[PDB]
Design a binder for these strands. Structure first.
Length: 88
RNA sequence: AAA
């Protein structure tokens, strides 16, 4: 699963890139006030779900990331996460 | 719905 982990990691790092966040109103509207999103919501996004439905593999791919931070079931951008949330 |  190592290569699949790499593809999943780079995909989710794109969702949490500044490039994407400046236009990703859906994702920001789903953030809580600290920037956190359920990892299972990210798991449902088409390009991730195509790669895997294995939630342990998604968690392991994100543990590998410098871009995001995981707390329990939730994930957010590590850098300035509070700047991105939007009203639902 | 590179939600």
């Amino acid at each position: 699963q190592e290569l699949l982990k790499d593809y999943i990691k780079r995909q989710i790092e794109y969702y949490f890139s500044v490039d994407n966040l400046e236009r990703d109103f859906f994702l920001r509207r789903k953030m809580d006030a600290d920037g956190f999103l359920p990892i299972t919501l990210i798991a449902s996004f088409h390009r991730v779900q195509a790669l895997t439905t294995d939630i342990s593999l998604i968690f392991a791919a994100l543990k590998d990331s410098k871009v995001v931070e995981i707390v329990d079931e939730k994930v957010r951008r590590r850098e300035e996460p509070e700047k991105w949330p939007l009203p639902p």
